[PDB]
C-alpha cells in the first residue's frame, strides 16, 4: 500500500510539472471537403508529438432540400448528428474511445458545464451573442432552399486541461495515431415523418429528396510541446499516460411497463458518467413514458431513485438547462461507479409506457487502466 | 490558545467524512390533498447517518372558475407554493424558519443563477425547457386550468462540501420535525388593487381562483456509511455544532428621505442579506428608493450604493436581478458579525413611502448551537 | 551566482502578506463623485479619489439622455454601443505613474473577459418567477427614432488590483501629498454619432439622422473600492510588497499597413507579462464576423504557432471563456495562466492572416498586462 | 572564448568524420495521388533514421480548362504555386522551416546557382535538353484542354550536401518527425483575370472553370547512414546538429512613394538571404516601380543602395538569370546579417509607384540555435 | 534639454492619432540624435 501512495504521490507531482514546463499547443493536422456520397469515413493521422491531450474536429456542411413542396425540421440531435461515430487508436494500436456523435457532443456539454460552445443569451445592449456561428443550423430547410451547419467535436484523451489522466504520449516516430471519422450521408441523416429520428439531422415530409451538397472537417491537436527532463529523462506522469479514459454506447433492449430494466454496470471500470436515452420506438418524450430512474447497487438499496422531473433538476444543476427529450443523464465524477467497491452496481428505468422496438441507448464515460 | 486545532480536526473530519461516506438522495414522503381542507404538513424524516438538507418538490393545478376574467403571475410566482418551512432537528433545536419565497432566493443565490432554471442559448441542438422542472403558466384565462411545478432545498449543511450545519441523526433516535405550511385558496390569488407579495396569482378572477389539489414530495439528502476510527466514528464536531439558518422578520416605519435602519443581532454571522421593499403593496425597480447600505455605528457605511450600483453588485453574483423591489447584499467571504446587539445595520433610505410601506427582511446565517 | 532564494523568499513573503491583508482589512465600496453635465460644454474630466488605504479599483456609473432631433430619419446601435459612452480613461497613483491608459470599448471588454460573461449582463431563463433585466443595469434602446429620446445606462470596473483576491496592481494611498487621478473623456456630440457609412468604431448611435442626435446630458458617479484598516505588525504594516509595486494596466494600440494573404505581425514588447490580447479589425470601417480572414495565431521567434486558427475555430475557443462571441471583427486570446512574457521565449508576436483587406484597414489592439512599477 | 574556438574545431572535425565515413541514402517515404477538392493538406510521416538532410517531393497534376470559349495562362510562379505552404517539425517537434512553395523555390533556385532543376539551352546538335520534363507546365491551357505538370521542391534540413549545419539527428523509434504540405486547389490555383496572381498557377478568362483533376507528391528523404562510432559513441557535429537552418516568409504593408520602406530584420537570426516581392496591388513589376533597393544599418549608411537593374545586374551574377517581376533577391551567404554584430539593419526600398493594396512580401533563409 | 533615451527599443514611441487617413497616408519621420561611435 505504500508503494501504491507513493506511486499515486510521483504521478501528480510529474502531472504539475510537465503542466508548469511544457507549453500547450493547439494547431491542424488535417482538412479535407467531399460529398458523403462519393465517401464517408476517414482515417487521420495525428501528428506524434509530445503528450497528446485531444482533437478539436470542426465540421460543416450544406445540405439542399429539393422536395418540389415539403420542407424538413431539425431533429432533436439536429447538428451533432453529423458525425455517426468517432474511433481513436493510440501508437501501440490501444483503441481509446469509440462512440457515436451524439454521445460524444453530450458529454462536451456535461464537461463544459452549459451546452457545448453555444451563446449564452443575455439583455446586453453590446452587440455580443451569436456572432461567429460556431455550432449552427438552419431550424428548418424549406422545400427547394439550402441550408449551412457548423458543428463542434472534442474528442478526449486526456480528461482535463488539469488532469492528464488519459492522455497519450506520442514520440515514437514509426507508430502512428489514428482518428477515425465516419460521417453522416443521405442515408443517416434524413429522416421520413414517422420514421426514428435517432440519428438524423432533419425529418419532415421533405425528407426523400433532401441531399448533402458537401460536408468539410479540420482536425486540430491539442497537445504540450517541450516536455521537461530531469535526472531519468521525460519527467512523466506515469499513472496519468497508461491509463485510458474513454467513451463507449450501446443499446439495451427488453423494457416492460411498471417494471424495473436494469442496466449492469457490466465491466471493472471507473464510470465518471452515464447517460441513458429512452428511444421508445422512435418516440423521444419528456419523462412522460417513465415512472422513475436510479442507480442501484447488489444490495438492491438506490442511492438516487428519483421521479423524471427530480431527476432532471439534478441535471440542470450540472448543465444549466435539459439535455434533449428522452435523454438522461447522471454524474458519478467525484466518486465513479467501481463495482469493486460495492456489490455490481445498474442503471435502472422504469417505464411508465413502452412502444414497440423500445430500448436505452446507454452512454458511458469511463478510466480504465491499460494492464 | 486551542481552536487552531480544534478547527484543524474538524476540518480533518469532515474531508473524512466526504472521502468515506457514500451520498444519498431518498424519498422520505408524497401526499396529495386540497388546501380547503388542510394546508400545514408536519414531515417526518429518517434518522440515518448525517442528514445534509431536503429538496422539496411541489406540483398544483389552479383552476380559475370565473366567468369572463383571468389571473397573471405575481412577481414570485410559483415561490409562494409554499408559504413557510420550519425544521427542528433530534434535539429539539430549530434551523431554518422562513418564507417560501426567501427560502427561494437564497436557493437561487447559492447557486449564482435562478434556482433550477434552463439557461437560453443559440444551440441548435434542442437543449431548453424540455422538463419544466420549475413552471407555471404566465397567465390562466377565465374557465381553464393551469399546471405548475416548484422546488426548494432546504439547507441544514451550508454546501455539498461544507457540512457546517449538517445534523447528525444516525443516532439521536428522537424525531426531526420537517413542518411545511403550504399556499391556500386565501393565499394564493390576489385581486386586483390588493398586496401580491404572498400571492401566486393576481387579476380580475382572482376571486373565483381555487386549486385543484396540490402535491409534494420531500426528497432527503443524508451521506450514510460514515467513517470510523479508534475512538469511533470520525464526525467534524465544529460543523455539527454550528446551526446553519434562515431566517425572516419584518420591520416598519419607514419615512421619505430619511435612513430606515435594521439592526443585526449580536452572536449570529450573517452570511447574506435580503429586503424587500413591500411599498404599500407596490413593487418597484429601484425608483422608489435613494440609496441602500450596510453601517457600522462610528464607523459610517461600508457599501452606501443608489439602487441601480447595488443591482450590479448582485448581477455578478445571480447573473441577472431579483424581481422588483427585492435587494440582496452577499456577505460570505466577511460574514456581519458583532458581538454587541445592531454595532451593524441594513440600511434603506426611501425616496417614496406609501401607505402600509415595511421592509421584509431574510437572513442567512451560522450560530453556535451553544 | 544562486543567492535567488531572495526571489523565492520574496514572493512568500509577499503572497503571506497578502493573505493577511485580505484576512484582516475590511472592504469598501465609497461614492466619491457625482457629476451631471452637457457634452457640448465639456467632455473631459479629472477625478481626484480618496487616498484611503489599499486601492483596488473604481466602479465608474455612467447614464446618459440622447436626443434624435432629426425631423425623419432614426438611428440604431453601433456593436459597441453604450461602451464608448467613456472614450478614454487614464489612471495615475500618487506617485504620478500612469497604470491604465485605454478605451471604453476596450476596458469594457477586458471587464466582460473577467467576469466569463458579457459584463453585468442579465441572462435569459425558464424561470416563471420574475428575475430578468428589473434593474437595467447596462441598457441603451436599440434604435432611437427621429423625435425621440433614449435613456441609456453603463458601467466600467477601472481595476488597479488584478481581482478580489490577488492584490497583484492594488496602489497604497496614505500620503496626503500627492493625489491619484482617474482621468475621463467621455463621449460628446462629435463622437456619438455616426452617418451612414461613416465609421461606427467609437460611436454609439449610427444610422441616417446621426447629424441631428445629440446629448441632453449624461451623468456619471464614481465608486471607490478599497481596503480600509489595514493590519499592523511589530515591523509597522503588514504589506505585500511586490503586489503594491507592480502595475496592472490595460493599454490599447493602432497598426496598420495589412494586405490580402499576408501575416500581419504585431510583436508583444519585453518586459511586460501579457495575460490577455484582444484585436480589433477595423477593415476600413467595415466590421465582419470572420469572413475578412483567413486565421489568426500567436507565434514565437521560431515560426512556431502555438494556436493558428481559422476564425470560427478561435472564437469558439473564446465562447469557452465569456459564454457568447466579441461583437464583430472583435477578436480574444486569453494568456492568463501563462503570461506571453518575451524573456520567457524568443520575441513572440500577434498574427493576423487577412482574406479581405478594405482602404484604411487596421488592427486596433487591446493589452491586459502586468510590469514592474521599476 | 577558448571554449568556444575549440567547440567549433570538434564540431567541424565531427563533420567531416560523418560525411567520410557515413554514406548517403535518399530513398521514398511516402507517395498518394488525391484531388484536392477532396482534400489539400498532408501531414507526412519521415523515416527515423541516422542524418537527416532535406526531402525531396516531386509533384504532379493535371489542370482541365472547360471554360467554353477562354484560356488560361501561366502565372509568373505557375508551377510553384502547386504547393502554397511546408512546415517541418523535428522528433523534438520544434519547427524548422515554414514557408511558401514559391520562396522554397527561389531559394532551391538561389543555392543552386540557376533555375531550379532546369534544361539550358545550347547550339549541341546532340539530342540533350528538355527531355524527361523535370519541372514542366504548359504555357497555357486553352478552353476545353487538360495539361499536366510536374514540379520539384527541396525541403532542406541541412544548409547544404557538405555544411551539416541544420540536419536533424533522427534515431529515437518513438518520436516522429513531421512534414506538412499544404496544396493548392481550384481557389488558389486559379486566378481571373485582373486579379492577383501571386499565389496562382494559371490566370485568365477561363479560369473560373479551370479545375485539378488531380495532384499526386511523392516525397524523398536523404539521409546519412552507418554514422561513424568512436570512443564515446556517434562522432556527430554538436554545433550543427543543434542549429536550425530555417525558410521563412511574411507581408509587409504601408508603402508610398518615394519614402524609404525599411524592414528590420526583427530577429537575432544569422540572415543568410532576403528575398522581396513587391505585390504591388496584383501588379507585378520589372523594376519600373521602385527607385531603388538596399540594406541599411541603424548607422543610416547603406552597404548597397542599387537603382534596380544595377541591383538585377548582382542577381544576375548569383542564379545566372533574373528572377520573375517583382522579385528581388539579396545574398549574405559569406556575411550574413547580424543585428548583434552592428547595429539593427533592415532592408530597404524606395517606391516610385504604390497602387492599392500594395505590399512587401519578405522571405528569409536564416541560422538559429535551438537555444 | 532631456533626450529621448531608452535602454530598451521603442521603450517610447511618438504617437499621432489622425481623425482622418485619405489613401496612401503615411507619416515620414525626421530625428535629430547623439549616439556613440562605440
Given at each position: 500500500a505504500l508503494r501504491n501512495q507513493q506511486a499515486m504521490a510521483a504521478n501528480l507531482q510529474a502531472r504539475q510539472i510537465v503542466l508548469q514546463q511544457s507549453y500547450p499547443v493547439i494547431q491542424q493536422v488535417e482538412?479535407?471537403?467531399?460529398?458523403?456520397?462519393?465517401?464517408?469515413?476517414?482515417?487521420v493521422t495525428p501528428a506524434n508529438v509530445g503528450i497528446v491531450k485531444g482533437f478539436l474536429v470542426k465540421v460543416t456542411a450544406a445540405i439542399t432540400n429539393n422536395h418540389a413542396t415539403e420542407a424538413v425540421a431539425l431533429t432533436d440531435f439536429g447538428p451533432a448528428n453529423l458525425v455517426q461515430r468517432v474511433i481513436y487508436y493510440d501508437p501501440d494500436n490501444q483503441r481509446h474511445t469509440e462512440?457515436?456523435?451524439?454521445?460524444?457532443?453530450?458529454?462536451?456539454?456535461?464537461?463544459?458545464?452549459?451546452?457545448?460552445?453555444?451563446?449564452?443569451?443575455?439583455?446586453?445592449?453590446?452587440?455580443?451573442?451569436?456572432?461567429?456561428?460556431?455550432?449552427?443550423?438552419?431550424?428548418?430547410?424549406?422545400?427547394?432552399?439550402?441550408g449551412e451547419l457548423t458543428m463542434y467535436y472534442w474528442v478526449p484523451l486526456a480528461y482535463s486541461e488539469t488532469d492528464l489522466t488519459g492522455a497519450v504520449l506520442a514520440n515514437v516516430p514509426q507508430s502512428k495515431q489514428r482518428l477515425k471519422l465516419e460521417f453522416?450521408?443521405?442515408?443517416?441523416?434524413?429522416?421520413?415523418?414517422?420514421?426514428?429520428?435517432?440519428?438524423?439531422?432533419?425529418?419532415?415530409?421533405?425528407?426523400?429528396?433532401?441531399?448533402?451538397?458537401?460536408?468539410?472537417?479540420?482536425?486540430?491537436?491539442?497537445?504540450?510541446?517541450?516536455?521537461?527532463?530531469?535526472?531519468?529523462?521525460?519527467?512523466?506522469?506515469?499513472?496519468?499516460?497508461?491509463?485510458?479514459?474513454?467513451?463507449?454506447?450501446?443499446?439495451?433492449?427488453?423494457?416492460?411497463?411498471?417494471?424495473?430494466?436494469?442496466?449492469?454496470?457490466?465491466?471493472?471500470?471507473?464510470?465518471?458518467?452515464?447517460?441513458?436515452?429512452?428511444?421508445?420506438?422512435?418516440?423521444?418524450?419528456?419523462?412522460?413514458?417513465?415512472?422513475?430512474?436510479?442507480?442501484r447497487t447488489a444490495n438492491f438499496s438506490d442511492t438516487r431513485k428519483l421521479d423524471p422531473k427530480t431527476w432532471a433538476a439534478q441535471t440542470r444543476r450540472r448543465i444549466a438547462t435539459d439535455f434533449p427529450k428522452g435523454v438522461y443523464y447522471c454524474d458519478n465524477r467525484d466518486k465513479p461507479i467501481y463495482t469493486l467497491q460495492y456489490g455490481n452496481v445498474g442503471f435502472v428505468v422504469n417505464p411508465k409506457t413502452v412502444n414497440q422496438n423500445a430500448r436505452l441507448l446507454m452512454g458511458y464515460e469511463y478510466f480504465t487502466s491499460r494492464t
Open positions: 482538412t479535407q471537403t467531399f460529398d458523403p456520397a462519393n465517401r464517408s469515413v476517414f482515417d462512440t457515436s456523435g451524439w454521445h460524444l457532443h453530450f458529454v462536451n456539454t456535461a464537461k463544459q458545464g452549459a451546452p457545448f460552445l453555444s451563446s449564452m443569451v443575455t439583455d446586453s445592449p453590446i452587440k455580443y451573442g451569436d456572432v461567429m456561428n460556431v455550432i449552427d443550423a438552419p431550424a428548418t430547410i424549406a422545400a427547394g432552399a439550402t453522416a450521408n443521405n442515408n443517416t441523416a434524413f429522416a421520413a415523418v414517422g420514421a426514428n429520428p435517432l440519428e438524423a439531422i432533419y425529418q419532415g415530409a421533405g425528407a426523400a429528396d433532401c441531399e448533402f451538397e458537401e460536408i468539410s472537417y479540420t482536425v486540430y491537436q491539442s497537445y504540450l510541446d517541450q516536455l521537461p527532463v530531469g535526472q531519468n529523462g521525460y519527467i512523466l506522469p506515469l499513472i496519468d499516460l497508461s491509463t485510458l479514459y474513454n467513451l463507449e454506447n450501446s443499446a439495451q433492449a427488453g423494457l416492460t411497463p411498471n417494471v424495473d430494466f436494469v442496466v449492469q454496470y457490466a465491466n471493472l471500470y471507473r464510470y465518471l458518467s452515464t447517460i441513458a436515452v429512452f428511444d421508445n420506438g422512435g418516440s423521444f418524450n419528456a419523462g412522460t413514458d417513465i415512472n422513475y430512474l436510479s442507480q
